[PDB]
């Protein structure tokens, strides 16, 4: 529901470099719920192990989110993790593979087969917008050469990203092609070790309309999928000023997000939304009629030991 | 870092700035005509924090003076600081917004903010280790409001990496005369709470009360209100402006002062606010100055401290004393006044000590506080904004100059969240 | 002869540094012109360059400078050589993310290279004295980084830390436990032996013991300096053992994690009692166990005692020294903990204390510095524990520190190790 926020963690398996080079497997699973990572337990909703299926994952996690987006609520899904953590496979996977495909092509599938199930009373009209936050400002992931967008609260006092390209989307292929031009236009940075380093939190909003010709009611369904960048120790990376500018921006907004989840998880007094620009756009998505899933993406390798830790320590 | 740059925004921003400058000049031993006629080299030393150099003996204030229509620049050039300002830094313009915030941030001011962006860029590119902008800002005016905010926004877009420290005049709904003020203030705050780093709020009624009742000036003229703003603007810069005992910088204040990031509406205060006379001596000796500073109505915004609570409080002492009261009275006043200070911040009071007092005086204090009572000031502005907006009043002002209904609503909704936010930390506690 | 580099960083660690070196100037007889006037050989801390110029091994490191200005223009300008005066520019006062990460990066090399250079000019290196403001912004952000460096760049030589952990009352940052926690996590790995410094007891002591009114930090630095200087006197001045840095470490804290000791100096007294009575070797040693006279105002009454190392500097009689300690050890009902074996380690040096031309202590004869470790530091660690959780549960301030350069993870990790460190000081029993 709203109250029960699905904090999940999903460990990838070890890779042939991690297996041959021999950074070991950290986890000691207590259960479905709880894992021991290096001395300290971390309890969550669901710890998916490295032996889990994409189908099991999606159906426990994602499938009900979509039904609820559809049936009267909105939904959020958050994906948190660093480069090579296994975020690619969890959030996207590979669409030609019916096993291998993840959260975004499975949502495109159950959304469009929700379309192809019902008949001509609901008028399904999906619009999508794709935008990144990069050095404070909101860049449009679709349309090139903008400075900032305006994220306006309406008469219902809900944030609409004004200035963005909304894509009136009609085919599940069109959904997908969108991601590809989008991801191409992203601010990723390439270093020598860190190749696809994500320097933007990116918000994908699938606005599913379904307004009934019959019952006349204005039926809708906003799904926010938020691509969360990974939290970076500049003691670790050692970088330059311009790359540190990014890394503090990430860390700040991430941490501010955890303060709202903490205040949401508390059910506190103010429950902030205003100060972080991300929590501003996701004002109602954090704190409203939202069924919300946080998918944590970690390595079980001893390379990324303090990264897993730092990430798991999120969930309060 | 080193160089603070100063910006005078609004007819008052000009005035209160020019007095600030008058003070700091006199303080570092510079004549308001031009020359360093000064004695103390220690008081000379860190001049570049505010001043630009010039012909060796003259020092140039690194001011940017913003005013929409002409005439204000003419008043300051006319004034006894006059010639100490370099005429390039008179950033005047032609046509006016006349209080109207929309007219200011959208319409008119657009021609001038390229100009100003040029000038501040020039002085910022002029600097060694750029510290921050300290902007004297008529919060509910038009030149200060809509243009000063438009500028803050250009300044922020340009420099995230510098300290945007504002001194922001927002008087009460009791003594104020500017009509559309409740609109100008909401629109201005909607930019400020998003944009600025540390906003030190100031009230003319509080300055009036300080003069009339605490100090006992007969007629509180503007330059009198300036005497007190300039003193606290002088206060807050003190420790980086001179060598002392302890810390310096305004960020070292601010990092301590703001517990969550939008709680940046500060309340300064000054002391000795003693009537001019002989006893005086049996008003305050040294420890007793702290007892004055910690007292109720001494504050540049008039917050009755029984009415809210405090978050972080800091205190800039100027004069050659010990942390004796900073040991003793800061303990005892947090012990006894326990109701006032929020118990979630482990020991709330944050003192520095600078050796140099104000020129001629012996011990001064600057209070710098985050008073949760500040939200009543916002509550009434938000009321009056609701009233005017609910009436649909002043269309032939704002909406004519292109203000949007969503951005009215937003600024309101932001201001009410600011209220709810400052109020939650009033409410908030320890275990 | 065995050459000890004193590094001092922070507002206070610099200031206090300056007083340390001013009493070392006076103890060793250097005039502010640079010149030793007569025949002595204090080449530990000082060195004569060729002309009559004794240059210290004092490394002043700072941000935007205060004291270095006052030093090279005015205060022993002709003693301190400008190459050893390391100024900085950008800001981090309070802010640990700007300290240990951002501005620390821009600093480190210019500082480190200067250190490697002085340590090149130290031929017979004894090791480091590192003086720093532990909870401070100017201090600990960069010094925790500097120690991280010198743990490799120096290797097996020891870092003798003096660590200003704040008073339960006098508190100039709000975020001083955030500093100190992160600072502790760092020194837990990269410091050799850590002398926890206060403000409170020290000020308490000036009013109770010293009986001057409520003095300025200048006089109070002249208190600390007396205490640092007595520690170093045993290297500086000739006499018994306790020359090595390792001679403290090894003697004090042989349990590897338990590396913060405490200390005190005596006689601290009034010029009145100086005239009025003459203190005996027993009475100064009885002042060594005195609870009110102890350096960090953590309570020795509620605490139990661990190791005890006593440095006597003055003409003392070793029998009477053996008796003072024998008797007071035998007699006082203080718990010497059952984990420690029984015994003090004593140290008697010829040279008496030296007094400053100031407004401070008078010309006493015989003098002692108690080094100890006691369980009472856990009380100090309790304030950290209380105070941290009090903001952290709130998540106050985190927009300044995690927002500007720190990672949030790092806060919990240090919370866990500090807490295990309280379990370390709780492993003090049988
Ligand atoms: N004994 C002593 N204490 C001092 C002196 N100067 C400051 N202190 C205080 O003792 C503690 C030392 O911290 P600081 O040195 O001020 O911390 P800092 O490194 O300057 O940290 P920032 O102010 O954040 O840059 C503070 O609470 C000071 O107020 C001094 O000369 N001696
Ligand atoms: N403290 C102070 N207040 C003043 C002074 N002169 C005018 N005021 C008041 O403070 C506000 C100044 O507004 P102004 O600077 O005119 O706003 P602008 O329209 O943006 O130029 C008004 O409400 C004035 O009555 C002065 O020198 N000092």
Numbering used by the authors:
A (entry chain K): 5 to 320
B (entry chain B): 1 to 44, 47 to 360, 369 to 441
C (entry chain A): 1 to 38, 46 to 437
Passage from the reporting paper:
mediated by the ‘linchpin’ residue N255. place via microtubule interactions of the N255 ‘linchpin’ residue. relax into its open state and release ADP. substantial loss of ADP affinity that occurs with microtubule attachment. However, the no-nucleotide conformation proposed by Atherton et al.
